[PDB]
Tab-separated table of C-alpha atoms and ligand atoms in Angstrom:
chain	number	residue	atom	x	y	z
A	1	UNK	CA	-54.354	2.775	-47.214
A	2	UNK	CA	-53.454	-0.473	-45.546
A	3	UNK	CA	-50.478	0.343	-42.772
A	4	UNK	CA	-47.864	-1.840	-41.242
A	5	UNK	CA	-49.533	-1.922	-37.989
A	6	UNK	CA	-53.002	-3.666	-39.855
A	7	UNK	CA	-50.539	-5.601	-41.255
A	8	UNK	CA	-48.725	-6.507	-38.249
A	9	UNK	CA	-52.282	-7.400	-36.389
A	10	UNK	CA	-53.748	-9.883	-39.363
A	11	UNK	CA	-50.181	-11.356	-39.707
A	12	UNK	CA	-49.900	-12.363	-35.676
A	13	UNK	CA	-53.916	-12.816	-35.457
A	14	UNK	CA	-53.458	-15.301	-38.016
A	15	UNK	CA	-50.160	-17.041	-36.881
A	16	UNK	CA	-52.081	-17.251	-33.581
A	17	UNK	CA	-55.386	-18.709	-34.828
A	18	UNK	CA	-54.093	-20.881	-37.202
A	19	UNK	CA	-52.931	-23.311	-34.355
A	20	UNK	CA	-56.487	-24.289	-34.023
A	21	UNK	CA	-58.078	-23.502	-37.661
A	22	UNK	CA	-59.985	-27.221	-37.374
A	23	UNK	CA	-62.337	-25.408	-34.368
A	24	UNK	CA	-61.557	-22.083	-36.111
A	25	UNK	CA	-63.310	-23.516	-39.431
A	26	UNK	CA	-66.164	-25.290	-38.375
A	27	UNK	CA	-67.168	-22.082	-35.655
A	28	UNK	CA	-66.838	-19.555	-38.878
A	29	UNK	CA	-69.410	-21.873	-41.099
A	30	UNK	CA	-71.491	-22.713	-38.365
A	31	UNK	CA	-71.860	-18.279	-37.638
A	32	UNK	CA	-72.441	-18.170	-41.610
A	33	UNK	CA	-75.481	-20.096	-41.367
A	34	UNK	CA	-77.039	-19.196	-37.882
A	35	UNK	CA	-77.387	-15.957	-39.783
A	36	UNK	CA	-78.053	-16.680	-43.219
A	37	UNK	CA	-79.627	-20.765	-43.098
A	38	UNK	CA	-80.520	-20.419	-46.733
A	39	UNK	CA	-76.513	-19.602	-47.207
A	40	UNK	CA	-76.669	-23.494	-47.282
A	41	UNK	CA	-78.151	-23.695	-50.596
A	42	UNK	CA	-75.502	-21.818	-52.534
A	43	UNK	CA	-73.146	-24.521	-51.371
A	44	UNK	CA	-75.013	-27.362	-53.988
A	45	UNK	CA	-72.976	-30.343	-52.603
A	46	UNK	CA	-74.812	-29.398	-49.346
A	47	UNK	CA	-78.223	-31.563	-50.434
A	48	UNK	CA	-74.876	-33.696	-40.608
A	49	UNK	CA	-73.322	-28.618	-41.620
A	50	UNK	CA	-70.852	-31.121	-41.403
A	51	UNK	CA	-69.387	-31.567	-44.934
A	52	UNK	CA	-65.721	-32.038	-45.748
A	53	UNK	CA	-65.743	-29.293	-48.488
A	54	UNK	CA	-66.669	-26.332	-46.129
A	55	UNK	CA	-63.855	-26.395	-43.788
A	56	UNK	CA	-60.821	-25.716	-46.337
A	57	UNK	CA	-63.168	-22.802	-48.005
A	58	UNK	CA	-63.282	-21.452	-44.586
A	59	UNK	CA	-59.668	-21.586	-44.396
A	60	UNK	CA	-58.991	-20.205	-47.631
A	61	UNK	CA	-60.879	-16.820	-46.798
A	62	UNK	CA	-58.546	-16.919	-43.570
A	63	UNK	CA	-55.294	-17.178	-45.463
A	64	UNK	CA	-56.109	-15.043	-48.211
A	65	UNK	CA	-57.255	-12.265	-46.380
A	66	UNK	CA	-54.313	-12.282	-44.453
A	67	UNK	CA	-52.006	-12.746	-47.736
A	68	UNK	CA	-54.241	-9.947	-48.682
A	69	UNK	CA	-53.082	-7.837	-45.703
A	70	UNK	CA	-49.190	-8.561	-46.470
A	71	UNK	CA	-49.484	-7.537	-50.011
A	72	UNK	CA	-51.587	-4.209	-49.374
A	73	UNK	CA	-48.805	-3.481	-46.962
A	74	UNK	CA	-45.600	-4.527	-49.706
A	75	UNK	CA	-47.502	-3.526	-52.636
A	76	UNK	CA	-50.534	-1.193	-52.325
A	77	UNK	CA	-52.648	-3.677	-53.806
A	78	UNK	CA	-54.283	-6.735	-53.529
A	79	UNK	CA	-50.966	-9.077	-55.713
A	80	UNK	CA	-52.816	-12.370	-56.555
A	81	UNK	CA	-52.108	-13.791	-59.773
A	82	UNK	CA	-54.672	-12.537	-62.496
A	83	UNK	CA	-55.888	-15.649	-62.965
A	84	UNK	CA	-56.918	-17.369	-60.070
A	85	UNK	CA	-58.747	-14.048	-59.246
A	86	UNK	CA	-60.602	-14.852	-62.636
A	87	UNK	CA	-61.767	-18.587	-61.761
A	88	UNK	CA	-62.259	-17.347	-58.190
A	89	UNK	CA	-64.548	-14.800	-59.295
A	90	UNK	CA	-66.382	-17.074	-62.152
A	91	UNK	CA	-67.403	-19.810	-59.411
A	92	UNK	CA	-68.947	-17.332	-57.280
A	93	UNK	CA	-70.858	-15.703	-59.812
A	94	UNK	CA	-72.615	-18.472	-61.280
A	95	UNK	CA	-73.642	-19.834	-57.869
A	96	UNK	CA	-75.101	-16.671	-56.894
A	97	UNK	CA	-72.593	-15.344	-54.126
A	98	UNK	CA	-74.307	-12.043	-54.366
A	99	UNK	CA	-73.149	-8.822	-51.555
A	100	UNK	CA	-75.487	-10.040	-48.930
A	101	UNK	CA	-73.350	-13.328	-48.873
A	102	UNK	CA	-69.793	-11.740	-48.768
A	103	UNK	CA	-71.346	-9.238	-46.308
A	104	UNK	CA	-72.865	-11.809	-44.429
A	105	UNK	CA	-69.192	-13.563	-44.383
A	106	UNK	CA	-67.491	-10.611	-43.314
A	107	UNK	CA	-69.708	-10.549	-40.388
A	108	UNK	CA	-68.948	-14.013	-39.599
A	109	UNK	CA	-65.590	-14.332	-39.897
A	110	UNK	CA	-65.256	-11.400	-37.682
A	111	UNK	CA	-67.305	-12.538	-34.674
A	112	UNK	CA	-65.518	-16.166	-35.250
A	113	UNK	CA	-62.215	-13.816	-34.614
A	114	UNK	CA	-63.518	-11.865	-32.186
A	115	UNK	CA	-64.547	-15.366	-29.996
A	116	UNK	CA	-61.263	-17.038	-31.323
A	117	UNK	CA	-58.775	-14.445	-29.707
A	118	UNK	CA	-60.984	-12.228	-27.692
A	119	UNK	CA	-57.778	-11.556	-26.118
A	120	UNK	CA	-56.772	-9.769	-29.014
A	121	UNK	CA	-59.547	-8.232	-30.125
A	122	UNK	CA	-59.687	-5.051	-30.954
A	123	UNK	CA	-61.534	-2.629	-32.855
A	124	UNK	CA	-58.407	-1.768	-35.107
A	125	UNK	CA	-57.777	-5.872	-35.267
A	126	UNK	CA	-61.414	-6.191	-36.523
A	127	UNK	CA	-60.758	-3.279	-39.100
A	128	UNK	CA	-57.524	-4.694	-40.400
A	129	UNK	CA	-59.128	-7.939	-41.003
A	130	UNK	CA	-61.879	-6.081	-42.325
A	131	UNK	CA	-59.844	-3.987	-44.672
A	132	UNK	CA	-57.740	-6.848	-45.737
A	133	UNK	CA	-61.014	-8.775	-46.402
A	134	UNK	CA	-63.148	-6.078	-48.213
A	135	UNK	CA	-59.267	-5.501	-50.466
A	136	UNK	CA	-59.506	-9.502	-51.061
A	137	UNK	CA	-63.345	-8.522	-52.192
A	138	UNK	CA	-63.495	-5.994	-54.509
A	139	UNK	CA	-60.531	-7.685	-56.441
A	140	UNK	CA	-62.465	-10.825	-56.453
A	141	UNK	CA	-66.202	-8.886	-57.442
A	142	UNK	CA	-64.109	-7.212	-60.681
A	143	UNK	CA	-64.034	-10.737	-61.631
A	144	UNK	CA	-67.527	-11.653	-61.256
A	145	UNK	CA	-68.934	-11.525	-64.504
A	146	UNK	CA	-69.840	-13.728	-67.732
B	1	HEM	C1	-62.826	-13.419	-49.260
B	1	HEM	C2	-63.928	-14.120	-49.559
B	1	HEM	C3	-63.880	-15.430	-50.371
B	1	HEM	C4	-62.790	-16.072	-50.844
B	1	HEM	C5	-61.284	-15.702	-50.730
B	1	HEM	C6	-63.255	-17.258	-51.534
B	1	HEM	C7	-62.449	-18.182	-52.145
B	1	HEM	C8	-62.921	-19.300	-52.778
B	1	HEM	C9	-62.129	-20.269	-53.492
B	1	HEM	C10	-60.585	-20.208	-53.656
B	1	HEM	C11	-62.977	-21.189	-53.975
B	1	HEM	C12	-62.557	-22.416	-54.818
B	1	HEM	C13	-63.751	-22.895	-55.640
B	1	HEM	C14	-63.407	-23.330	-57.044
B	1	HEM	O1	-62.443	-22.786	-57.684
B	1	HEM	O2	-64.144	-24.250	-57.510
B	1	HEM	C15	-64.340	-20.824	-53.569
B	1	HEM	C16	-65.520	-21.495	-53.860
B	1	HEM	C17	-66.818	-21.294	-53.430
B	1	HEM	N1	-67.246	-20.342	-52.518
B	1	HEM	FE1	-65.921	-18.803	-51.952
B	1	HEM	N2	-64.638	-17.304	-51.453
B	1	HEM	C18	-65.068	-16.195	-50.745
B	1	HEM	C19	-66.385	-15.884	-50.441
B	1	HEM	C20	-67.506	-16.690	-50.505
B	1	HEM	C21	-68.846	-16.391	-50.012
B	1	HEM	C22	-69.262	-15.099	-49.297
B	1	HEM	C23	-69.660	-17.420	-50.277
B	1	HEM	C24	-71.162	-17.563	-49.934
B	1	HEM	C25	-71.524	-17.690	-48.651
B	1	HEM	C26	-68.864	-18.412	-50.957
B	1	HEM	C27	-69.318	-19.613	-51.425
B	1	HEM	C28	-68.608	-20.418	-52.284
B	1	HEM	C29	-69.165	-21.482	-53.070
B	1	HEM	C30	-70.644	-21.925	-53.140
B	1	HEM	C31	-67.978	-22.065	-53.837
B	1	HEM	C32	-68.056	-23.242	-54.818
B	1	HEM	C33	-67.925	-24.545	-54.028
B	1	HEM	C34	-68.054	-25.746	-54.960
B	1	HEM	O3	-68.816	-25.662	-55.974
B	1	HEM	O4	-67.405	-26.805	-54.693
B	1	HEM	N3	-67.569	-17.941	-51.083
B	1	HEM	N4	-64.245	-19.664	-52.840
């Protein structure tokens, strides 16, 4: 169960980092592919890492994991509208965003969080974003199909 205090540590983490999400952005993507180069190709546009279209989708798994975090905390669940979760899910289904990818993310956006504010890292801040995240996830992968 997601607690105040995970709540309370996405929340400030967030209000903190998103000073600098332009650096924030670009160092999350640029994690993504040191690991998985061939990420690149599920991206189609990608055919300068530089491209305009990366940076907001970085920024968008930032705010929505920690909207994610608020509404586990108010709600018990993850509380975004039925239907965004739907066309979120459909686009990353048919490009072939498969575990390995959102697992490969997680990983990511947790070391670009870790180097971001390493003075508030943590291993209960990198659980609560990782909670939050997984949450954001598995709402996200019921929506993944035909
Ligand atoms: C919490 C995790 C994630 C969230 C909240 C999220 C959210 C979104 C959103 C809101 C869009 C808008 C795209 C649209 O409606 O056309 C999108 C697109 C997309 N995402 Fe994600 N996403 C996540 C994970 C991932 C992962 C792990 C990958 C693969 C590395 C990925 C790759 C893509 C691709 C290829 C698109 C389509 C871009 C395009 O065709 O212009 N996403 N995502």
């Amino acid at each position: 169960v997601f607690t105040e205090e995970q709540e309370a540590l996405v929340v400030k983490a967030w209000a903190v980092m998103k000073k600098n999400s332009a650096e924030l952005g670009l160092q999350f993507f640029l994690k993504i592919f040191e690991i998985a180069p061939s990420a690149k190709n599920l991206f189609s546009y990608l055919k300068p890492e530089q491209n305009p279209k990366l940076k907001p989708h970085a920024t968008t798994v930032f705010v929505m994991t920690c909207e994610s975090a608020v509404q586990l905390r108010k709600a018990g669940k993850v509380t975004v509208k039925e239907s965004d979760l739907k066309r979120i899910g459909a686009i990353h289904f048919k490009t072939g965003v498969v575990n390995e990818h959102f697992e490969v993310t997680r990983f990511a956006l947790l070391e670009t969080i870790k180097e971001a504010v390493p003075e508030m890292w943590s291993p209960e801040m990198k659980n609560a974003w990782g909670v939050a995240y997984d949450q954001l996830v598995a709402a996200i992968k019921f929506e993944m199909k035909p």
